[model samples]
Target: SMEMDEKDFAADSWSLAVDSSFLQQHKKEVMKQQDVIYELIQTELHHVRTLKIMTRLFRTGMLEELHLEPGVVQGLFPCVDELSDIHTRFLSQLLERRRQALCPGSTRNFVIHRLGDLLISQFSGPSAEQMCKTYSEFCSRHSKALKLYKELYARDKRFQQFIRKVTRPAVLKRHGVQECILLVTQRITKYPLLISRILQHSHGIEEERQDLTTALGLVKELLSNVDEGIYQLEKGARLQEIYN
Candidate 1:
């Protein structure tokens, strides 16, 4: 029963196969390319996991069990639901691509020939715009969210107790609210790095490299905009502090 529950618990999670015999047949560069793709998928899954912990577990705990007002909960986790939705959609797309690429008669391994196509789709058009806007909101409000969380936790005994127990969950593994918020705020910046790594190993593949470069450019722009938004917010906050 415990094993069944564990399987169900991780049903939404993604697993990668590194030791498959098909992977062994590839040359060093091809294997490197696959390695980066593996990392890309792994990181995205982990990001989704983090977002789930925030939205599903912590957010509901605050709203239902602690009986906090909706606005207060929203303030504590600004744009988290939207972020979760966006990443979940992207994750599903990646998984679907993997599903179509699965090796014949095999469940655990497959070679993905064109990750660039997926990256291009993800970092273009309406989807890219949504990520930019939502991440901007989340990153810009991070400091305020932290402040609100700290204040509430310090003064409200009920909240303090709730946080202690909530963060105790093995899934959370002692990752408190502040740590989670920081994790989310930094997630947008990681794409450029990871995408560039993927691009590095994509040598000799003209079409894929071109598509990855385009996706990298789009994500870099999005990340810069997010950074600029956060900078402006902090600057304005400082000016207001000076005025006081």
Candidate 2:
């Protein structure tokens, strides 16, 4: 209104919106969309557990029954500890929010937090280092991965069943070991994609828009550097495989 200053108008937009049911509806829709995210977290966490367990079997030389080489590609899993730490923390935070729901008795008052913090974390320095390295190691060893699997499947009956179990198409298409690797590799790109979309629908919400834009820029830069490393590591390893 003519009596109001710019700051007053700016502050009042989402301030009142939250008091309205549209805000509640928006929150619900966002949470619903994030259900896929919840499934991904669970599945990826499962992927990590499966890898760690298999590696342990190999680590303890329990594969003695399989007649495999002592040091196969099983060592390609430096990600178990780090990825487990990150996802457990992330998942626990989400679950904790549910536990302390504002409407503790019912699902009526679900309030998902804004995405600004998570968007930033997707490209954080430590996060970028750990995720990119783990993925790049897996990527660099792609041929070797298959090579080991080939030998095991051909030579070891027990190992063959293990591969077919893990690679079974029923569940493997969505969340197999390779699929998890691919998903984690590309998950960084998802942050900016969603952030920009969030910015789109939140035009009047200036504060959120500001942080999201900043996080968007930072995520892109972090993405570029990760690409530089991953691309070359894959190229170099693949070439070495060709020559050798």
Candidate 3:
């Protein structure tokens, strides 16, 4: 009984903060590193929020105000409710641990690196597995998705306006089904880079560094799956046109 609620994709109340005093203490000090770790967290939060919100919109039928067919919808999207729930909770945990790792009076602490371990284990295992499965299927159907969308858009005036109206929001700019598909196809690749950044400044922490390194490798494998899907789908789209 998953009750669906109307969600506003424009809403983004979640925020992330790092202990500034810690970084000010000659922070690889993840402190000895650059000053932009906070920004990095914020950036990741932004993408996560965007994906979660967008998926909810689709799940709740806002994206389908165009009244797309069930087959078309199935081809284009995965079980977004599940996917969004996974990442939404993940980001919340990330922000929570960052706050907890902040030492009472001191802003800088070694505990923040624990979040790295969390990322490695959580994403490298379940997250990557789920994503690898979900996106491959989602991407494989991309051709049918855009194909049906075009047929509907050109034939049904109401559908055309609905598509335009829903995607008009600044937050969802270029967030049409295809754009969303492409964004997520590439999104999984971002983890390794982010983890590598934290690892760079995290000198002497072998456990954390090794965990990030492994996670990087694991996620990269997942990225290969997604990229392969994108390639197959793009080629499929061409074949579809040849047959149509």
Best by lDDT: 1
| TM-score computed on alpha carbons, candidate 1 | 0.87
Candidate 1's C-alpha runs over 4 A off are 1-16, 231-244
In candidate 1, residue 4 scores what lDDT? Answer: 28
Instruction: Work out the TM-score per prediction.
Output: 0.87, 0.60, 0.70
Question: 111-207 in candidate 2: lDDT tens per residue?
Answer: 4445556546655678766766765554555544545545556787777666565556663456544444455555556656655665655444567
Alpha-carbon error at 177 in model 3, in Å?
3.5
Q: For candidate 3, what is the lDDT?
A: 0.59
Query: Which sequence of candidate numbers ranks them by lDDT, best first?
Result: 1, 3, 2
Instruction: List, residue by residue over 1-244, the lDDT tens digit for candidate 3.
Output: 1121112111221111234454355433544333334444555566565566555565356444655556555555655556566666766676667668656774334245555567666666667687677777766665666676566678988766666767788857766766766665566666777767767876667886777677677777877877776644442345557565
Q: Rate the local accuracy (lDDT) of all candidates.
A: 0.76, 0.51, 0.59
Sorted on TM-score, best first, the list reads 1, 3, 2
Clashing pairs in 2: none
Which lDDT value does model 2 have at 182?
52
Candidate 3 deviant stretches above 4 angstroms: 1-23, 32-40, 62-67, 103-111, 225-244
Of the pair 1 and 2, which is ahead by TM-score?
1
What are the C-alpha RMSDs, in order, of all predicted structures? 4.1, 11.2, 6.2
Q: What is the per-residue lDDT of model 1 for residues 144-203, given as tens digits with 9 covering 90 to 100?
A: 788888889889999999988877767677467898898887777888888998899897
